[PDB]
Amino acid sequence: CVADYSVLYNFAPFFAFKCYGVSPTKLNDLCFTNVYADSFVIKGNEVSQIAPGQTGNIADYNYKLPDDFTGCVIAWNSNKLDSKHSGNYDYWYRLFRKSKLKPFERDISTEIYQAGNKPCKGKGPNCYFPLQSYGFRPTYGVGHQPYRVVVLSFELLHAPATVCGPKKSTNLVKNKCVNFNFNGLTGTGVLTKSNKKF
């Protein structure tokens, strides 16, 4: 399809919207193989922990990515929409994972926090459950609020792109020497009205 990248600039200013493996000026005029739309919620302090290559203690816990992640990851606050004065214990996250994760892999498969002499597994001492409830409040300061984040990977690879930015046009001038371009038909001349029967 045709993907325009001025849509978010219409929207609110997303705080940690950054680009690493792409060209910011050529975004609207670059072709990508596909688009990936990983969208999740992070708290403010560990938002940057979801980083390309620099996998934070949360990235290896929840969602990792390759070193050369091409595209842009957009992060913004969702406090007022997704915060309750009683604590967002419905919004959970594996705060207690054990090792490194792998790119494009949900943590729905639970990685039980098992580290100790106990083969206990599941939940409990030395066998804790990795999942932790965010417990968000709209009254919290910075670093403890639900920054909703999305991974918009701009993958461009061997498969044909077919996902590029739009192209604008200009007016039509007749009976005047001019240059022209019609879907890639260069040339100069005088354009008039014809009576052919295509």
Partner: protein, 596 residues
């Protein structure tokens, strides 16, 4: 595999749980504080119960891993905290009796009342008038009657209760790793694990005696002046050199002589440096004062308060059914929520109190990033000192000129600084004797040196000696003067202040020295300083990962306590005391008794 790996796996969830449940309990308590209703009381109580009970499930597994194979020392200190403040030894009966004694002590002390003389018709409590009858009323007969009646009506009831409480605490400490509950209080400053900074428990008695004696000549010099001024208004009652009666102190416990500022004034004709009168003229209010207090931290460099704090903190008393208690509290809840619940009037004293309260919030916010189990100062007194130094620095005439309420035309001379020096000494120097004597008597009563029937006698043996104040009416074993005191009747260690006062002066002199500031030590503002602010911020975010000796050596390059900054601060006042008391006797007559 190892002890540390399993311990940190165990602590991973417990750190978050200690954040969560403690925040829930503190939030219930804070909602009750902002909204005093019965249901808020129930929420506070239930949240505290659930939090403290959940502490047991993790302290049980904390003792499961002993403390003799720990090399990080984070696990070691955190497990020591778990096995001390979430563990106990007393059986259900002994602990129940202890808590019942505490509850009865609090009930009698708070609900105790003294009626007007020769009449049961009208009766008053301690807070409404007794703190003000001593402070304001000066009549001999009325004050003597109120003092005798109140002290009797508290001590006579509470003394056997304290005799039972001390024995129960001694038994609990004996079952603990302490010799006695006196040693249990002596173990608060203890340090272990790091050689060269470990604190010996036996030094606490030895250290205090070192400096206090050297400052004893000063206090009696002050006593050489007070008895001169008091006899100005009380000629017949007071002996020329004898001990002072214990019912005209101006306060119930003889803590301060500053409230006698008018009585003990050096020069009563120079007006005070007052901006409260000028506050109205310049349309000042609470928000302006608090914003300039924030600007103080802005100029020094410490991070300022977030708008989330200013939005929710109650600056003024709502009144009506939305009643509260505006006592200065620097609430430490965490999760970015640090709020101040204190009602502020348009005065310079409330300005000082606002700085004092905001300092502790600053410290808590600075070290909040540390683990919740180590989110503590070096000891009890460092947290107080953090706000106390800024509160003291908020008493500088030059920065008050910078405020604008006090015009720059104000002048510096003898009677705009010496008048403040005497007030500051009466605040600081005058409290030292009772401050040390209370801890001394508590140590003596808990240790067991004194026979029971002599417990009160020793209490009145050192009153004539250390403070130089004698009772106006003898009090036997039935009476208990410390039972009328806040800390003793409610089991609160009083040793925190006798060290915070020593630490704050060193902190203030370090700030004044590293910033290249000249002039007398009573003129020092750190608003336009960066080295002092940075060197304070170095300690601000450290947390509990250091002891108090090491942290104190990170201030002035000296591990242990000292008194040189305190002597230097009142050094012109020391010269004043020496000069003006040439013909007045130095000391006090213990044997003298005004009660015939």
């Amino acid at each position: 595999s190892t002890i540390e790996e399993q311990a940190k796996t165990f602590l991973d969830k417990f750190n978050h749980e200690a954040e969560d449940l403690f925040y829930q309990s503190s939030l219930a308590s804070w909602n009750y504080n902002t909204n005093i209703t019965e249901e808020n009381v129930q929420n506070m109580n239930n949240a505290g119960d659930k939090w403290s009970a959940f502490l047991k499930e993790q302290s049980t597994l904390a003792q499961m891993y002993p403390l003799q194979e720990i090399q990080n020392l984070t696990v070691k200190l955190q497990l020591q905290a778990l096995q001390q403040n979430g563990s106990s030894v007393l059986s259900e009966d002994k602990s129940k009796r202890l808590n019942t004694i505490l509850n009865t002590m609090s009930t009698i002390y708070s609900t105790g009342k003294v009626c007007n003389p020769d009449n049961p018709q009208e009766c008053l409590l301690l807070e409404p008038g007794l703190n003000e009858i001593m402070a304001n009323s000066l009549d001999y007969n009325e004050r003597l009657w109120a003092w005798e009646s109140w002290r009797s009506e508290v001590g006579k009831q509470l003394r056997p209760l304290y005799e039972e409480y001390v024995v129960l605490k001694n038994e609990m400490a004996r079952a603990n790793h302490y010799e006695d509950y006196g040693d249990y209080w002596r173990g608060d400053y203890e340090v272990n694990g790091v050689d060269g900074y470990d604190y010996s428990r036996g030094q606490l008695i030895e250290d205090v005696e070192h400096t206090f004696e050297e400052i004893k000549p000063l206090y009696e010099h002050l006593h050489a002046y007070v008895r001169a001024k008091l006899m100005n208004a009380y000629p017949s009652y007071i002996s020329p050199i004898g001990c002072l009666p214990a019912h005209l102190l101006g306060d119930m416990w003889g803590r301060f002589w500053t409230n006698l500022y008018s009585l003990t004034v050096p020069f009563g004709q120079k007006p005070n440096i007052d901006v409260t009168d000028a506050m109205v003229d310049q349309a000042w209010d609470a928000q302006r004062i608090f914003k300039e207090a924030e600007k103080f931290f802005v100029s020094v460099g410490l991070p300022n308060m977030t708008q989330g704090f200013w939005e929710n903190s109650m600056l003024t008393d709502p009144g009506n059914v939305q009643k509260a208690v505006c006592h200065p509290t620097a609430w430490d809840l965490g999760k970015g929520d640090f709020r101040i619940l204190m009602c502020t009037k348009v005065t310079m004293d409330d300005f000082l109190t606002a700085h004092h309260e905001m300092g502790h919030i600053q410290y808590d916010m600075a070290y909040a990033a540390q683990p919740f189990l180590l989110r503590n100062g070096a000891n009890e007194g460092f947290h107080e000192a953090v706000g106390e130094i800024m509160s003291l620095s908020a008493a500088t005439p030059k920065h008050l000129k910078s405020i604008g309420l006090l015009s720059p035309d104000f002048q510096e001379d003898n009677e705009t600084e010496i008048n403040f020096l005497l007030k500051q000494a009466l605040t600081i120097v005058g409290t030292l004797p009772f401050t040390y004597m209370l801890e001394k008597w508590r140590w003596m009563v808990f240790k067991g040196e004194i026979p029971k029937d002599q417990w009160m006698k020793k209490w009145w043996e050192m009153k004539r000696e250390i403070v130089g104040v004698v009772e106006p009416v003898p009090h036997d074993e039935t009476y208990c003067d410390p039972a009328s005191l806040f800390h003793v009747s409610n089991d609160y260690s009083f040793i925190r202040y006798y060290t915070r006062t020593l630490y704050q002066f060193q902190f203030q002199e370090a700030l004044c020295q590293a910033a290249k500031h000249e002039g007398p030590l009573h003129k020092c503002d750190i608003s336009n300083s960066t080295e002092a602010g940075q060197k304070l911020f170095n300690m601000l975010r450290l947390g509990k990962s250091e002891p108090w000796t090491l942290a104190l050596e990170n201030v002035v390059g000296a591990k242990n306590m000292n008194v040189r900054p305190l002597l230097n601060y009142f050094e012109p006042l020391f010269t004043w005391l020496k000069d003006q008391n040439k013909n007045s006797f130095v000391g006090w007559s213990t044997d003298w008794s005004p009660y015939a």
